[PDB]
Amino acid sequence: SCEPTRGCPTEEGCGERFRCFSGQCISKSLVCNGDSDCDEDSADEDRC
């Protein structure tokens, strides 16, 4: 057991980037590119 002193770090800001299933935020240039855009999963799929 431990006593929390400092606050926990929040998640990094995902600015103007379409988030993935895991959290890798990539640019919107790859939207509906018909390939492995996120490079980790096909979560987005952009209804492409």
Binding site: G7, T10, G13, C14, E16
Partner: protein, 664 residues
Amino acid sequence: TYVISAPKIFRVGASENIVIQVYGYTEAFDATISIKSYPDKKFSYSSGHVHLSSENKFQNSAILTIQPKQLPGGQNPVSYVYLEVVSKHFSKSKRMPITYDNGFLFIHTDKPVYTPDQSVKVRVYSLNDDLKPAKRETVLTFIDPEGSEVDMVEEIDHIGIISFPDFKIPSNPRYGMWTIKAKYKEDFSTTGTAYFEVKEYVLPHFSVSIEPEYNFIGYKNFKNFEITIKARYFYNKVVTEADVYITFGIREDLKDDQKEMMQTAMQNTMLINGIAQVTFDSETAVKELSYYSLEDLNNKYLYIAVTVIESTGGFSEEAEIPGIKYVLSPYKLNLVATPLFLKPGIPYPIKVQVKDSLDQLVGGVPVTLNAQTIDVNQETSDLDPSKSVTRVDDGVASFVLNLPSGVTVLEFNVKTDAPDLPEENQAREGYRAIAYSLSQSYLYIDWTDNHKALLVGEHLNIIVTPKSPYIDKITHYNYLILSKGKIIHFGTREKFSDASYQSINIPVTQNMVPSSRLLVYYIVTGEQTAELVSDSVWLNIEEKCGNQLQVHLSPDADAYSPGQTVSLNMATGMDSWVALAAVDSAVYGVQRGAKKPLERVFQFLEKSDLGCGAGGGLNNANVFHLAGLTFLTNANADDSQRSYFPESWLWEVHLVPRRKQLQF
């Protein structure tokens, strides 16, 4: 999460309230926000601190100010702002554009018409964003109508009503429309502009008002057009009898003042009981003087001159109308106070307005629209058309359309329907409305200000609905009402399973009289990432003064004898400074009516709103930029994309308690 809501454009020397919200936790941690310049490293304008607890539900708002700490000189004086947040769990920075546009300048002149060798009594009303007097130095420059500057004068403001010395007209005046600008002269913005014309207002004998039956001559008015010419005295009494001479003419444009004209009339009519009306057909004029008789050929103004002389005594007064052009295309349509967006499943009101050729609303014209409700996934169907008429008093046509829950966008073609307007020459304007999302969550606020506009002191209820949320259990409701680009109050409510839609009660205040805006955003907790949904709709209410200043003379009579000693009593709610001005009703020259001295205190004050449109729009970033805000959160970002008697008199400024009375 850590959603920070802030106005889009900050004002220098103004109290900008910055609010912060937390997703909620069992531990209460403090937060801190600061105002830093372009150097990161190393400067700081001000530093505010807030406190979070279970009583405040982990939201708080602190006012921030921007003072003249900027570097003197340089290639750019603004270096707008860098905003930071100091919190235990989160810390982020973002730049935001600012502007020195703070306060308002109301230049009030005693007279719109000046003669050579005459004093110029003028006062400037200095104001802040919070409607405070904001005692500030102000310079006043004068510009000749030819474009050259005349004289500049500076004076310090101690009371709140900037009193200026009486200007003097040079020995060689330049007739025309002059220009008056005012600046704070050290470091500020929002320069005010006032206009006044120097002309000869020696004596208007009687006001001649030209009120035609119809604004612009149409197809039905081509064969017969009847116009009413009424002349009335300045002391509210009509003219008994007078000879009225009518003169017609055709002008190509409003800029050309001299054009050929009939030469046929010269119609002599008699004024009866202060009202006269005569029938004028356009066929004879277009056949005789125009040299070509067809309404398709002549697309140009129609100038009419009226000379009214009294048969019982030698007098003459003249009036004129700019022009009435025969246009093949009908009057144009436009939308006002109507968000061009869609809410699925909820009836979307449609408010359209019809304006004439030159910036004036039209009434009594039936209009209809054709709409096509399209499905999100597959084929569509045609929605049943609806037809209605526009009222002359309201000026805006009202329409309501109910759409299914599976509609994405809608297109409506509003066209006019009239017996004289053909199908080839018709007014049609197509538009498109796009609905609001990755989490499929939506938000809506109702009643679209059709109450109609409300007063101050009565509580209003607004229904919200989180249709298709990410999760059925919602933490809390968050809504913020803003006005003049500032957050006046921040609301909060709880969500229960009692019903699907909850009504929130929002108290109205005196500071929101000109206009207001409200936005309702709720955050959800996603299994991987979060996404919040917001929505906003315009807020239009009535115009009630806070001071409640009313002027009334102690003697109560319809008519007063010349030279009678009268007393004027001022009645205010709180202590305030008054600025009295006794302007004659005859000083208003023809001058296209000589509209009014100001006539606009709230309408010109509405310019403080940063965003445009009524409300609603695309994803949270676009709708917050349209509402005039910029948000900071983890989920989403925001993209910037000698006697007697000369006029005028009674130019004084006095202190007024709850009841003050003066004698003159």
